[PDB]
PDB file of C-alpha atoms and ligand atoms in Angstrom:
ATOM      1  CA  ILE A   1     266.706 -31.781 -42.641  1.00  0.00           C
ATOM      2  CA  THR A   2     266.366 -31.193 -38.687  1.00  0.00           C
ATOM      3  CA  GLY A   3     267.637 -33.725 -36.953  1.00  0.00           C
ATOM      4  CA  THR A   4     270.129 -35.695 -34.453  1.00  0.00           C
ATOM      5  CA  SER A   5     273.503 -35.267 -35.515  1.00  0.00           C
ATOM      6  CA  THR A   6     275.692 -39.072 -35.851  1.00  0.00           C
ATOM      7  CA  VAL A   7     278.392 -41.120 -37.295  1.00  0.00           C
ATOM      8  CA  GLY A   8     277.829 -44.054 -39.718  1.00  0.00           C
ATOM      9  CA  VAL A   9     279.530 -46.629 -41.656  1.00  0.00           C
ATOM     10  CA  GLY A  10     279.320 -47.320 -45.666  1.00  0.00           C
ATOM     11  CA  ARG A  11     281.227 -49.070 -48.393  1.00  0.00           C
ATOM     12  CA  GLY A  12     283.227 -46.751 -51.046  1.00  0.00           C
ATOM     13  CA  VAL A  13     283.132 -47.331 -54.823  1.00  0.00           C
ATOM     14  CA  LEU A  14     286.443 -48.903 -54.259  1.00  0.00           C
ATOM     15  CA  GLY A  15     285.444 -51.496 -51.754  1.00  0.00           C
ATOM     16  CA  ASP A  16     287.142 -49.431 -49.362  1.00  0.00           C
ATOM     17  CA  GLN A  17     285.588 -49.361 -45.253  1.00  0.00           C
ATOM     18  CA  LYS A  18     284.657 -45.118 -44.223  1.00  0.00           C
ATOM     19  CA  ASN A  19     283.234 -43.161 -41.824  1.00  0.00           C
ATOM     20  CA  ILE A  20     279.676 -40.538 -43.072  1.00  0.00           C
ATOM     21  CA  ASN A  21     278.661 -38.057 -41.089  1.00  0.00           C
ATOM     22  CA  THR A  22     274.915 -38.291 -41.092  1.00  0.00           C
ATOM     23  CA  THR A  23     271.642 -37.438 -39.464  1.00  0.00           C
ATOM     24  CA  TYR A  24     268.642 -39.395 -37.883  1.00  0.00           C
ATOM     25  CA  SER A  25     264.848 -38.021 -37.996  1.00  0.00           C
ATOM     26  CA  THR A  26     263.160 -41.491 -37.969  1.00  0.00           C
ATOM     27  CA  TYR A  27     265.903 -42.034 -41.675  1.00  0.00           C
ATOM     28  CA  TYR A  28     269.518 -41.805 -41.505  1.00  0.00           C
ATOM     29  CA  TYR A  29     270.059 -38.974 -44.274  1.00  0.00           C
ATOM     30  CA  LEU A  30     273.350 -37.797 -46.043  1.00  0.00           C
ATOM     31  CA  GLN A  31     273.339 -34.859 -44.284  1.00  0.00           C
ATOM     32  CA  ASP A  32     277.147 -33.859 -42.276  1.00  0.00           C
ATOM     33  CA  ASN A  33     275.948 -31.415 -40.453  1.00  0.00           C
ATOM     34  CA  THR A  34     279.764 -31.024 -38.667  1.00  0.00           C
ATOM     35  CA  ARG A  35     281.453 -28.070 -41.683  1.00  0.00           C
ATOM     36  CA  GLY A  36     280.172 -25.215 -41.833  1.00  0.00           C
ATOM     37  CA  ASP A  37     275.678 -24.887 -43.392  1.00  0.00           C
ATOM     38  CA  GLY A  38     276.248 -28.458 -44.314  1.00  0.00           C
ATOM     39  CA  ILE A  39     277.032 -31.186 -46.949  1.00  0.00           C
ATOM     40  CA  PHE A  40     274.053 -32.370 -48.602  1.00  0.00           C
ATOM     41  CA  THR A  41     274.095 -35.291 -50.618  1.00  0.00           C
ATOM     42  CA  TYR A  42     271.205 -36.816 -52.845  1.00  0.00           C
ATOM     43  CA  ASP A  43     269.580 -40.040 -54.872  1.00  0.00           C
ATOM     44  CA  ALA A  44     269.276 -38.813 -58.437  1.00  0.00           C
ATOM     45  CA  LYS A  45     267.864 -42.544 -58.883  1.00  0.00           C
ATOM     46  CA  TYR A  46     268.909 -43.057 -62.608  1.00  0.00           C
ATOM     47  CA  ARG A  47     267.076 -38.953 -64.375  1.00  0.00           C
ATOM     48  CA  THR A  48     268.386 -36.057 -64.623  1.00  0.00           C
ATOM     49  CA  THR A  49     265.901 -34.170 -62.623  1.00  0.00           C
ATOM     50  CA  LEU A  50     268.381 -32.767 -59.810  1.00  0.00           C
ATOM     51  CA  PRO A  51     268.640 -32.619 -56.987  1.00  0.00           C
ATOM     52  CA  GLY A  52     266.616 -35.353 -56.664  1.00  0.00           C
ATOM     53  CA  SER A  53     265.765 -37.464 -53.172  1.00  0.00           C
ATOM     54  CA  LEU A  54     268.225 -36.479 -50.197  1.00  0.00           C
ATOM     55  CA  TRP A  55     270.179 -39.709 -49.467  1.00  0.00           C
ATOM     56  CA  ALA A  56     267.422 -41.955 -46.341  1.00  0.00           C
ATOM     57  CA  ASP A  57     268.642 -44.566 -45.124  1.00  0.00           C
ATOM     58  CA  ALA A  58     267.019 -46.832 -42.499  1.00  0.00           C
ATOM     59  CA  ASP A  59     269.809 -47.747 -40.426  1.00  0.00           C
ATOM     60  CA  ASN A  60     272.680 -45.874 -40.872  1.00  0.00           C
ATOM     61  CA  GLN A  61     274.684 -48.542 -42.562  1.00  0.00           C
ATOM     62  CA  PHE A  62     275.806 -48.528 -46.506  1.00  0.00           C
ATOM     63  CA  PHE A  63     277.540 -51.129 -47.084  1.00  0.00           C
ATOM     64  CA  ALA A  64     274.787 -51.548 -50.754  1.00  0.00           C
ATOM     65  CA  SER A  65     275.658 -51.843 -53.723  1.00  0.00           C
ATOM     66  CA  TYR A  66     273.920 -48.889 -54.821  1.00  0.00           C
ATOM     67  CA  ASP A  67     274.982 -46.868 -51.818  1.00  0.00           C
ATOM     68  CA  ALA A  68     278.953 -46.696 -52.792  1.00  0.00           C
ATOM     69  CA  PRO A  69     278.325 -43.356 -55.453  1.00  0.00           C
ATOM     70  CA  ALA A  70     276.598 -42.128 -52.409  1.00  0.00           C
ATOM     71  CA  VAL A  71     278.766 -43.126 -49.296  1.00  0.00           C
ATOM     72  CA  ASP A  72     281.788 -41.148 -51.766  1.00  0.00           C
ATOM     73  CA  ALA A  73     280.603 -38.078 -52.292  1.00  0.00           C
ATOM     74  CA  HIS A  74     279.393 -37.354 -48.751  1.00  0.00           C
ATOM     75  CA  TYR A  75     282.967 -38.220 -47.957  1.00  0.00           C
ATOM     76  CA  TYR A  76     285.159 -36.388 -50.465  1.00  0.00           C
ATOM     77  CA  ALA A  77     282.817 -32.950 -50.872  1.00  0.00           C
ATOM     78  CA  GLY A  78     283.684 -33.597 -46.268  1.00  0.00           C
ATOM     79  CA  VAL A  79     287.788 -33.487 -47.095  1.00  0.00           C
ATOM     80  CA  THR A  80     287.826 -31.215 -50.456  1.00  0.00           C
ATOM     81  CA  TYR A  81     285.735 -28.691 -47.714  1.00  0.00           C
ATOM     82  CA  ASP A  82     288.884 -29.826 -44.937  1.00  0.00           C
ATOM     83  CA  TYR A  83     291.526 -28.482 -46.919  1.00  0.00           C
ATOM     84  CA  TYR A  84     290.461 -25.716 -48.701  1.00  0.00           C
ATOM     85  CA  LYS A  85     289.453 -24.562 -44.242  1.00  0.00           C
ATOM     86  CA  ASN A  86     292.427 -26.131 -42.980  1.00  0.00           C
ATOM     87  CA  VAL A  87     295.608 -24.920 -45.269  1.00  0.00           C
ATOM     88  CA  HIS A  88     293.762 -22.508 -47.179  1.00  0.00           C
ATOM     89  CA  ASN A  89     291.385 -20.727 -44.833  1.00  0.00           C
ATOM     90  CA  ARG A  90     288.820 -20.440 -46.902  1.00  0.00           C
ATOM     91  CA  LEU A  91     285.109 -21.476 -45.171  1.00  0.00           C
ATOM     92  CA  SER A  92     283.122 -23.622 -48.522  1.00  0.00           C
ATOM     93  CA  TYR A  93     283.237 -22.062 -52.058  1.00  0.00           C
ATOM     94  CA  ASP A  94     281.904 -18.704 -51.840  1.00  0.00           C
ATOM     95  CA  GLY A  95     284.114 -18.321 -48.325  1.00  0.00           C
ATOM     96  CA  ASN A  96     281.044 -17.941 -46.311  1.00  0.00           C
ATOM     97  CA  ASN A  97     279.810 -22.141 -45.707  1.00  0.00           C
ATOM     98  CA  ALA A  98     277.304 -22.000 -48.207  1.00  0.00           C
ATOM     99  CA  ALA A  99     275.753 -26.379 -48.176  1.00  0.00           C
ATOM    100  CA  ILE A 100     277.813 -28.353 -50.397  1.00  0.00           C
ATOM    101  CA  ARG A 101     275.557 -30.455 -52.221  1.00  0.00           C
ATOM    102  CA  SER A 102     275.750 -33.339 -54.105  1.00  0.00           C
ATOM    103  CA  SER A 103     273.819 -35.980 -56.342  1.00  0.00           C
ATOM    104  CA  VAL A 104     275.018 -39.250 -58.147  1.00  0.00           C
ATOM    105  CA  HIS A 105     273.566 -41.961 -59.731  1.00  0.00           C
ATOM    106  CA  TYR A 106     272.061 -39.450 -62.596  1.00  0.00           C
ATOM    107  CA  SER A 107     271.052 -40.431 -65.799  1.00  0.00           C
ATOM    108  CA  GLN A 108     272.028 -43.841 -66.880  1.00  0.00           C
ATOM    109  CA  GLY A 109     275.483 -44.910 -67.729  1.00  0.00           C
ATOM    110  CA  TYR A 110     276.788 -41.705 -67.463  1.00  0.00           C
ATOM    111  CA  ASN A 111     280.487 -40.576 -68.103  1.00  0.00           C
ATOM    112  CA  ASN A 112     280.931 -37.616 -66.554  1.00  0.00           C
ATOM    113  CA  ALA A 113     280.298 -35.378 -63.516  1.00  0.00           C
ATOM    114  CA  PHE A 114     280.261 -31.304 -62.965  1.00  0.00           C
ATOM    115  CA  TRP A 115     279.805 -28.571 -61.154  1.00  0.00           C
ATOM    116  CA  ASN A 116     276.692 -27.471 -62.395  1.00  0.00           C
ATOM    117  CA  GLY A 117     276.449 -23.414 -60.901  1.00  0.00           C
ATOM    118  CA  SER A 118     274.991 -24.734 -57.994  1.00  0.00           C
ATOM    119  CA  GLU A 119     276.000 -28.781 -57.406  1.00  0.00           C
ATOM    120  CA  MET A 120     278.213 -31.720 -58.112  1.00  0.00           C
ATOM    121  CA  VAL A 121     276.566 -33.623 -60.387  1.00  0.00           C
ATOM    122  CA  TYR A 122     277.907 -37.197 -60.634  1.00  0.00           C
ATOM    123  CA  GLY A 123     276.679 -39.817 -63.512  1.00  0.00           C
ATOM    124  CA  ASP A 124     277.922 -43.624 -62.170  1.00  0.00           C
ATOM    125  CA  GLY A 125     279.690 -44.156 -65.837  1.00  0.00           C
ATOM    126  CA  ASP A 126     279.123 -46.970 -68.302  1.00  0.00           C
ATOM    127  CA  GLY A 127     280.904 -49.815 -66.296  1.00  0.00           C
ATOM    128  CA  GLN A 128     283.875 -49.936 -69.276  1.00  0.00           C
ATOM    129  CA  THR A 129     285.225 -46.349 -69.237  1.00  0.00           C
ATOM    130  CA  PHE A 130     284.553 -45.526 -66.046  1.00  0.00           C
ATOM    131  CA  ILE A 131     282.868 -46.760 -62.827  1.00  0.00           C
ATOM    132  CA  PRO A 132     280.916 -44.117 -60.427  1.00  0.00           C
ATOM    133  CA  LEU A 133     282.641 -40.469 -60.384  1.00  0.00           C
ATOM    134  CA  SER A 134     282.754 -39.548 -56.964  1.00  0.00           C
ATOM    135  CA  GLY A 135     284.774 -42.985 -56.359  1.00  0.00           C
ATOM    136  CA  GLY A 136     287.254 -40.784 -57.828  1.00  0.00           C
ATOM    137  CA  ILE A 137     288.757 -37.670 -55.348  1.00  0.00           C
ATOM    138  CA  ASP A 138     291.051 -36.065 -57.844  1.00  0.00           C
ATOM    139  CA  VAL A 139     287.329 -36.220 -59.504  1.00  0.00           C
ATOM    140  CA  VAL A 140     285.482 -34.282 -56.842  1.00  0.00           C
ATOM    141  CA  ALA A 141     288.102 -31.936 -55.674  1.00  0.00           C
ATOM    142  CA  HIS A 142     288.429 -30.955 -59.348  1.00  0.00           C
ATOM    143  CA  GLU A 143     284.916 -30.690 -59.780  1.00  0.00           C
ATOM    144  CA  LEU A 144     283.979 -28.661 -55.595  1.00  0.00           C
ATOM    145  CA  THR A 145     287.127 -26.356 -57.079  1.00  0.00           C
ATOM    146  CA  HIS A 146     285.222 -24.827 -60.693  1.00  0.00           C
ATOM    147  CA  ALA A 147     282.222 -23.494 -57.498  1.00  0.00           C
ATOM    148  CA  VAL A 148     285.728 -21.896 -55.832  1.00  0.00           C
ATOM    149  CA  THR A 149     286.602 -20.283 -59.272  1.00  0.00           C
ATOM    150  CA  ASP A 150     283.444 -19.323 -59.837  1.00  0.00           C
ATOM    151  CA  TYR A 151     283.038 -17.136 -56.631  1.00  0.00           C
ATOM    152  CA  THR A 152     286.699 -16.033 -56.588  1.00  0.00           C
ATOM    153  CA  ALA A 153     288.185 -14.815 -60.306  1.00  0.00           C
ATOM    154  CA  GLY A 154     285.443 -16.824 -62.213  1.00  0.00           C
ATOM    155  CA  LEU A 155     286.990 -17.194 -65.548  1.00  0.00           C
ATOM    156  CA  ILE A 156     284.891 -17.850 -68.596  1.00  0.00           C
ATOM    157  CA  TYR A 157     284.565 -21.807 -69.659  1.00  0.00           C
ATOM    158  CA  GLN A 158     285.930 -21.289 -73.315  1.00  0.00           C
ATOM    159  CA  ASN A 159     289.609 -20.070 -74.921  1.00  0.00           C
ATOM    160  CA  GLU A 160     292.512 -19.340 -72.335  1.00  0.00           C
ATOM    161  CA  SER A 161     290.228 -18.857 -69.888  1.00  0.00           C
ATOM    162  CA  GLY A 162     288.318 -21.584 -69.879  1.00  0.00           C
ATOM    163  CA  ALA A 163     292.223 -23.619 -70.437  1.00  0.00           C
ATOM    164  CA  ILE A 164     293.288 -21.848 -66.938  1.00  0.00           C
ATOM    165  CA  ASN A 165     289.799 -23.136 -65.665  1.00  0.00           C
ATOM    166  CA  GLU A 166     290.517 -26.695 -66.406  1.00  0.00           C
ATOM    167  CA  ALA A 167     294.005 -26.518 -64.959  1.00  0.00           C
ATOM    168  CA  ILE A 168     293.771 -25.396 -61.803  1.00  0.00           C
ATOM    169  CA  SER A 169     291.056 -27.499 -61.251  1.00  0.00           C
ATOM    170  CA  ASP A 170     293.687 -30.376 -62.040  1.00  0.00           C
ATOM    171  CA  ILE A 171     295.902 -28.655 -60.161  1.00  0.00           C
ATOM    172  CA  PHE A 172     294.103 -27.746 -56.785  1.00  0.00           C
ATOM    173  CA  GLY A 173     292.668 -31.754 -57.223  1.00  0.00           C
ATOM    174  CA  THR A 174     295.072 -33.020 -57.315  1.00  0.00           C
ATOM    175  CA  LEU A 175     296.571 -31.353 -54.308  1.00  0.00           C
ATOM    176  CA  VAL A 176     294.001 -32.491 -52.588  1.00  0.00           C
ATOM    177  CA  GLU A 177     294.748 -35.726 -53.386  1.00  0.00           C
ATOM    178  CA  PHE A 178     297.836 -35.601 -51.433  1.00  0.00           C
ATOM    179  CA  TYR A 179     296.337 -33.653 -48.320  1.00  0.00           C
ATOM    180  CA  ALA A 180     293.902 -36.943 -48.275  1.00  0.00           C
ATOM    181  CA  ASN A 181     297.368 -39.096 -48.593  1.00  0.00           C
ATOM    182  CA  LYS A 182     294.893 -41.359 -51.480  1.00  0.00           C
ATOM    183  CA  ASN A 183     297.628 -43.214 -52.845  1.00  0.00           C
ATOM    184  CA  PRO A 184     298.725 -39.676 -54.101  1.00  0.00           C
ATOM    185  CA  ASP A 185     300.161 -38.958 -57.517  1.00  0.00           C
ATOM    186  CA  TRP A 186     300.110 -36.324 -61.237  1.00  0.00           C
ATOM    187  CA  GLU A 187     297.414 -37.983 -63.137  1.00  0.00           C
ATOM    188  CA  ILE A 188     293.158 -37.241 -63.345  1.00  0.00           C
ATOM    189  CA  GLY A 189     290.822 -40.453 -62.764  1.00  0.00           C
ATOM    190  CA  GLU A 190     293.414 -42.792 -62.723  1.00  0.00           C
ATOM    191  CA  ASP A 191     290.449 -44.377 -59.795  1.00  0.00           C
ATOM    192  CA  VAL A 192     288.026 -44.122 -61.822  1.00  0.00           C
ATOM    193  CA  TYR A 193     288.501 -44.461 -65.252  1.00  0.00           C
ATOM    194  CA  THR A 194     288.892 -48.261 -66.966  1.00  0.00           C
ATOM    195  CA  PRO A 195     287.884 -50.250 -64.022  1.00  0.00           C
ATOM    196  CA  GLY A 196     290.073 -53.473 -67.177  1.00  0.00           C
ATOM    197  CA  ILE A 197     293.290 -51.559 -68.136  1.00  0.00           C
ATOM    198  CA  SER A 198     296.044 -51.081 -65.466  1.00  0.00           C
ATOM    199  CA  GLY A 199     298.042 -47.850 -64.765  1.00  0.00           C
ATOM    200  CA  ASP A 200     295.570 -45.492 -67.259  1.00  0.00           C
ATOM    201  CA  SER A 201     294.084 -41.858 -66.254  1.00  0.00           C
ATOM    202  CA  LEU A 202     291.750 -39.378 -68.545  1.00  0.00           C
ATOM    203  CA  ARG A 203     294.969 -36.268 -68.033  1.00  0.00           C
ATOM    204  CA  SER A 204     297.919 -36.282 -66.836  1.00  0.00           C
ATOM    205  CA  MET A 205     300.101 -32.956 -65.425  1.00  0.00           C
ATOM    206  CA  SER A 206     303.435 -34.771 -65.713  1.00  0.00           C
ATOM    207  CA  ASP A 207     303.489 -35.725 -68.879  1.00  0.00           C
ATOM    208  CA  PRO A 208     300.380 -34.214 -70.487  1.00  0.00           C
ATOM    209  CA  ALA A 209     301.334 -35.605 -74.295  1.00  0.00           C
ATOM    210  CA  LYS A 210     300.742 -39.257 -72.936  1.00  0.00           C
ATOM    211  CA  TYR A 211     297.327 -39.072 -74.448  1.00  0.00           C
ATOM    212  CA  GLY A 212     298.049 -36.473 -76.624  1.00  0.00           C
ATOM    213  CA  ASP A 213     297.359 -33.055 -74.910  1.00  0.00           C
ATOM    214  CA  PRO A 214     299.916 -30.617 -75.799  1.00  0.00           C
ATOM    215  CA  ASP A 215     302.698 -29.660 -73.750  1.00  0.00           C
ATOM    216  CA  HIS A 216     304.006 -26.593 -74.989  1.00  0.00           C
ATOM    217  CA  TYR A 217     302.490 -23.106 -76.309  1.00  0.00           C
ATOM    218  CA  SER A 218     303.668 -23.923 -79.307  1.00  0.00           C
ATOM    219  CA  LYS A 219     301.234 -27.325 -79.660  1.00  0.00           C
ATOM    220  CA  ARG A 220     298.106 -25.836 -77.997  1.00  0.00           C
ATOM    221  CA  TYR A 221     294.751 -26.013 -79.944  1.00  0.00           C
ATOM    222  CA  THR A 222     292.516 -23.598 -82.222  1.00  0.00           C
ATOM    223  CA  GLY A 223     290.233 -24.701 -83.145  1.00  0.00           C
ATOM    224  CA  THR A 224     286.689 -25.195 -82.461  1.00  0.00           C
ATOM    225  CA  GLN A 225     285.632 -27.982 -80.724  1.00  0.00           C
ATOM    226  CA  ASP A 226     286.073 -28.666 -76.846  1.00  0.00           C
ATOM    227  CA  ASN A 227     285.107 -24.387 -75.882  1.00  0.00           C
ATOM    228  CA  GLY A 228     288.323 -24.066 -78.056  1.00  0.00           C
ATOM    229  CA  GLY A 229     290.383 -27.180 -76.555  1.00  0.00           C
ATOM    230  CA  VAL A 230     289.402 -26.136 -72.259  1.00  0.00           C
ATOM    231  CA  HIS A 231     290.447 -29.767 -71.513  1.00  0.00           C
ATOM    232  CA  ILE A 232     293.190 -30.111 -73.818  1.00  0.00           C
ATOM    233  CA  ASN A 233     295.467 -26.735 -73.720  1.00  0.00           C
ATOM    234  CA  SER A 234     294.532 -27.616 -69.897  1.00  0.00           C
ATOM    235  CA  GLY A 235     298.098 -29.649 -70.654  1.00  0.00           C
ATOM    236  CA  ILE A 236     300.058 -26.826 -71.192  1.00  0.00           C
ATOM    237  CA  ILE A 237     299.567 -24.495 -67.556  1.00  0.00           C
ATOM    238  CA  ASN A 238     299.488 -28.598 -65.955  1.00  0.00           C
ATOM    239  CA  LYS A 239     303.171 -29.191 -67.244  1.00  0.00           C
ATOM    240  CA  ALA A 240     303.926 -26.118 -65.492  1.00  0.00           C
ATOM    241  CA  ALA A 241     302.687 -26.026 -61.992  1.00  0.00           C
ATOM    242  CA  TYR A 242     304.348 -29.722 -61.902  1.00  0.00           C
ATOM    243  CA  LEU A 243     307.781 -28.272 -63.070  1.00  0.00           C
ATOM    244  CA  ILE A 244     307.070 -25.683 -60.037  1.00  0.00           C
ATOM    245  CA  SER A 245     306.078 -28.376 -57.588  1.00  0.00           C
ATOM    246  CA  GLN A 246     308.897 -30.626 -59.207  1.00  0.00           C
ATOM    247  CA  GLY A 247     311.194 -29.223 -60.788  1.00  0.00           C
ATOM    248  CA  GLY A 248     312.837 -31.058 -64.234  1.00  0.00           C
ATOM    249  CA  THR A 249     314.036 -29.930 -67.645  1.00  0.00           C
ATOM    250  CA  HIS A 250     311.330 -29.488 -70.445  1.00  0.00           C
ATOM    251  CA  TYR A 251     312.059 -28.064 -74.239  1.00  0.00           C
ATOM    252  CA  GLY A 252     315.580 -27.598 -72.213  1.00  0.00           C
ATOM    253  CA  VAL A 253     314.845 -25.021 -69.622  1.00  0.00           C
ATOM    254  CA  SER A 254     315.294 -26.188 -66.100  1.00  0.00           C
ATOM    255  CA  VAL A 255     312.977 -25.316 -63.739  1.00  0.00           C
ATOM    256  CA  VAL A 256     314.024 -26.288 -60.007  1.00  0.00           C
ATOM    257  CA  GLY A 257     311.417 -27.348 -57.585  1.00  0.00           C
ATOM    258  CA  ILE A 258     309.728 -26.045 -54.370  1.00  0.00           C
ATOM    259  CA  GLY A 259     307.220 -28.260 -53.548  1.00  0.00           C
ATOM    260  CA  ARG A 260     303.621 -28.759 -53.735  1.00  0.00           C
ATOM    261  CA  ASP A 261     302.411 -26.638 -50.637  1.00  0.00           C
ATOM    262  CA  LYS A 262     304.023 -23.388 -52.299  1.00  0.00           C
ATOM    263  CA  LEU A 263     302.521 -24.318 -55.526  1.00  0.00           C
ATOM    264  CA  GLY A 264     298.961 -24.442 -53.960  1.00  0.00           C
ATOM    265  CA  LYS A 265     299.604 -21.614 -51.968  1.00  0.00           C
ATOM    266  CA  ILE A 266     300.988 -19.441 -55.099  1.00  0.00           C
ATOM    267  CA  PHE A 267     298.159 -20.692 -57.452  1.00  0.00           C
ATOM    268  CA  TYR A 268     295.236 -19.439 -54.735  1.00  0.00           C
ATOM    269  CA  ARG A 269     296.526 -16.280 -54.348  1.00  0.00           C
ATOM    270  CA  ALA A 270     296.496 -15.772 -58.152  1.00  0.00           C
ATOM    271  CA  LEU A 271     292.967 -16.998 -58.236  1.00  0.00           C
ATOM    272  CA  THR A 272     291.876 -15.872 -55.019  1.00  0.00           C
ATOM    273  CA  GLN A 273     293.587 -12.169 -55.669  1.00  0.00           C
ATOM    274  CA  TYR A 274     294.666 -11.641 -59.375  1.00  0.00           C
ATOM    275  CA  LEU A 275     292.201 -13.659 -61.805  1.00  0.00           C
ATOM    276  CA  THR A 276     289.626 -11.973 -64.000  1.00  0.00           C
ATOM    277  CA  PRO A 277     286.837 -13.369 -66.164  1.00  0.00           C
ATOM    278  CA  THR A 278     288.818 -13.381 -69.574  1.00  0.00           C
ATOM    279  CA  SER A 279     292.174 -13.566 -67.612  1.00  0.00           C
ATOM    280  CA  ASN A 280     294.810 -15.896 -70.720  1.00  0.00           C
ATOM    281  CA  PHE A 281     298.226 -17.724 -70.075  1.00  0.00           C
ATOM    282  CA  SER A 282     300.527 -14.359 -70.483  1.00  0.00           C
ATOM    283  CA  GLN A 283     298.006 -12.901 -67.664  1.00  0.00           C
ATOM    284  CA  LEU A 284     297.967 -16.403 -65.408  1.00  0.00           C
ATOM    285  CA  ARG A 285     302.016 -16.355 -66.017  1.00  0.00           C
ATOM    286  CA  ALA A 286     301.981 -12.424 -64.673  1.00  0.00           C
ATOM    287  CA  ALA A 287     299.307 -13.106 -61.546  1.00  0.00           C
ATOM    288  CA  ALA A 288     301.605 -15.670 -60.259  1.00  0.00           C
ATOM    289  CA  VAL A 289     304.961 -14.173 -60.313  1.00  0.00           C
ATOM    290  CA  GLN A 290     303.256 -11.280 -58.095  1.00  0.00           C
ATOM    291  CA  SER A 291     301.642 -14.130 -56.180  1.00  0.00           C
ATOM    292  CA  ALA A 292     305.358 -15.272 -55.170  1.00  0.00           C
ATOM    293  CA  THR A 293     306.087 -11.858 -54.798  1.00  0.00           C
ATOM    294  CA  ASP A 294     304.101 -11.885 -52.179  1.00  0.00           C
ATOM    295  CA  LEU A 295     304.558 -14.101 -50.189  1.00  0.00           C
ATOM    296  CA  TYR A 296     308.176 -14.968 -50.672  1.00  0.00           C
ATOM    297  CA  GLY A 297     309.954 -11.720 -52.350  1.00  0.00           C
ATOM    298  CA  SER A 298     311.226 -10.373 -55.747  1.00  0.00           C
ATOM    299  CA  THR A 299     314.535 -12.096 -55.779  1.00  0.00           C
ATOM    300  CA  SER A 300     312.955 -15.560 -53.749  1.00  0.00           C
ATOM    301  CA  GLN A 301     314.493 -19.157 -55.719  1.00  0.00           C
ATOM    302  CA  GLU A 302     310.133 -19.770 -55.539  1.00  0.00           C
ATOM    303  CA  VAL A 303     310.077 -16.653 -58.483  1.00  0.00           C
ATOM    304  CA  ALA A 304     312.250 -17.563 -59.869  1.00  0.00           C
ATOM    305  CA  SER A 305     311.207 -21.187 -59.823  1.00  0.00           C
ATOM    306  CA  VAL A 306     307.312 -19.651 -61.119  1.00  0.00           C
ATOM    307  CA  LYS A 307     309.230 -17.311 -64.422  1.00  0.00           C
ATOM    308  CA  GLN A 308     311.320 -20.573 -65.878  1.00  0.00           C
ATOM    309  CA  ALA A 309     307.897 -23.090 -65.534  1.00  0.00           C
ATOM    310  CA  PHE A 310     306.042 -20.856 -67.670  1.00  0.00           C
ATOM    311  CA  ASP A 311     309.241 -20.318 -69.811  1.00  0.00           C
ATOM    312  CA  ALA A 312     309.464 -23.749 -70.288  1.00  0.00           C
ATOM    313  CA  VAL A 313     306.312 -24.541 -71.860  1.00  0.00           C
ATOM    314  CA  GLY A 314     306.478 -21.542 -73.664  1.00  0.00           C
ATOM    315  CA  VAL A 315     304.456 -19.276 -72.118  1.00  0.00           C
ATOM    316  CA  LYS A 316     305.707 -15.480 -71.879  1.00  0.00           C
TER     317      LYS A 316
HETATM  318 CA1  LIG B   1     271.808 -48.759 -44.954  1.00  0.00          CA
HETATM  319 CA1  LIG B   2     296.182 -41.826 -57.247  1.00  0.00          CA
HETATM  320 CA1  LIG B   3     295.176 -39.072 -59.583  1.00  0.00          CA
HETATM  321 CA1  LIG B   4     292.199 -47.493 -66.198  1.00  0.00          CA
HETATM  322 ZN1  LIG B   5     287.090 -29.499 -65.310  1.00  0.00          ZN
END
């Protein structure tokens, strides 16, 4: 829409109050003109037709419970755009400020959220397994990172390359959660998963086996479900990335942590300059080692820690 940029106020899924960038033109729309070519939030009104209608509101105040998922989809897309811009100097997901669009209230009782190749889509959850998925900043950033991957390495969504694609989304989803300093941790989806149980999450990067995912290459899933285990075998890479950052001893192999910041620079470089659509775990290890080498020198502690971490999860 063409109109005047302004700032509205609302409440997210978890009840927190936040300011959001809106546009006025008769109605106030969830359209943020301050980031790239814009961030646009749509109402899919419980249908599966996309994108739905750009979200329009009469008084620029978004405190209705129907508003909550839109508030957080719109706000957390902005935080994720800021992370990529300020930390990695990348303007939006294509690197040229593409507009970011999201639809919320997709379908009924839909327990998932996803990047479809053109925009983000968020279910409201069934209220038992999940609450509206845009309330999780790691989920939002995980999904928006698939758009970055799609425009850069182009990892296909199956077998080892799909598992890398998923882990790269958990890694940067976590880094965004730390960047916003929103009670950060190494778990995925803990703010929106099972409202009735405290302390769990969908997946864990620090201990993937707590939820039954593999934490070592010898435990990888070899069957056909989940497109060859893309959500399961991502645990092996997630554990490696947690060790590079935080350090630890895993299956008797000791890793000196180098921190989150360097973790993000190594993996962003590996993703945008050395990964290809069919890269496997062994090629990811080579890419991460070469990236660390480029940035810190072949005899740095950073290169040594990337090697130990892949050794610890059995990836040669
Ligand atoms: Ca209103
Ligand atoms: Ca958290
Ligand atoms: Ca988290
Ligand atoms: Ca829970
Ligand atoms: Zn994913």
